[PDB]
Design a binder for these strands. Structure first.
Ligand SMILES: [Cl-]
Ligand SMILES: [Cl-]
Ligand SMILES: [Cl-]
Ligand SMILES: [Cl-]
Ligand SMILES: [Mg+2]
Ligand SMILES: [Mg+2]
Ligand SMILES: [Mg+2]
Ligand SMILES: [Mg+2]
Ligand SMILES: [Mg+2]
Ligand SMILES: [Mg+2]
Ligand SMILES: [Mg+2]
Ligand SMILES: [Zn+2]
Ligand SMILES: [Zn+2]
Ligand SMILES: [Zn+2]
Ligand SMILES: [Zn+2]
Lengths: 82, 81
DNA sequence: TGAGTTCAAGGGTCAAT
DNA sequence: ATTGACCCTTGAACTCA
């Protein structure tokens, strides 16, 4: 299940790739929501916040940049289903 | 549709492992986040119900713990907004 | 495997105190 | 300062091809 994979973004356990990157269900859901709602975030610190399991929700801006930096593809996010 | 296990007020679901109201939830969260220590004015046996719950923070906290609330379920503070 | 989904239980806000 | 009614986000667990 979540045996041989680690989230490239936050280090949490991973069941496989999502949007092109080995990632956890947290980072997958976060990236999907960000892309679908076309959200913009702001870092109130130095735009280099630590992204690990405990801290990944502290700064949405930095979490999102890391999703991109590790390879997440926005084009892989499909349209909501009606 | 439950009742808060701490003060007997009306519950909005489980919070930090226990059925509890928005009051007791926010109280526990704040206590844990700021790592506050309270002191009881009397015998550490203060009644904790809907109307008295704010009269002794020490006793309110000890009842939170005694009913099962988990410090570890309180997360790191998130950014302002 | 990797798209999709849901909603309980995390979060924050801010008028009232 | 703290409280709590009210609203927003997260992510474990599930379906579908
Ligand atoms: Cl990867
Ligand atoms: Cl005190
Ligand atoms: Cl008090
Ligand atoms: Cl959460
Ligand atoms: Mg996790
Ligand atoms: Mg996968
Ligand atoms: Mg996760
Ligand atoms: Mg990328
Ligand atoms: Mg909760
Ligand atoms: Mg409270
Ligand atoms: Mg949201
Ligand atoms: Zn992750
Ligand atoms: Zn940041
Ligand atoms: Zn309560
Ligand atoms: Zn007391």
């Amino acid at each position: 299940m979540f045996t041989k994979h680690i989230c490239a973004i936050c280090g949490d356990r991973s069941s496989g790739k999502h949007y092109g990157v080995y990632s956890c269900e947290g980072c997958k859901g976060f990236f999907k929501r960000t892309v679908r709602k076309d959200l913009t975030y702001t870092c109130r610190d130095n735009k280099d916040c630590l992204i690990d399991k405990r801290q990944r929700n502290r700064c949405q801006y930095c979490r999102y940049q890391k999703c991109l930096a590790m390879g997440m593809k926005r084009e892989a996010v499909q349209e909501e289903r009606q």
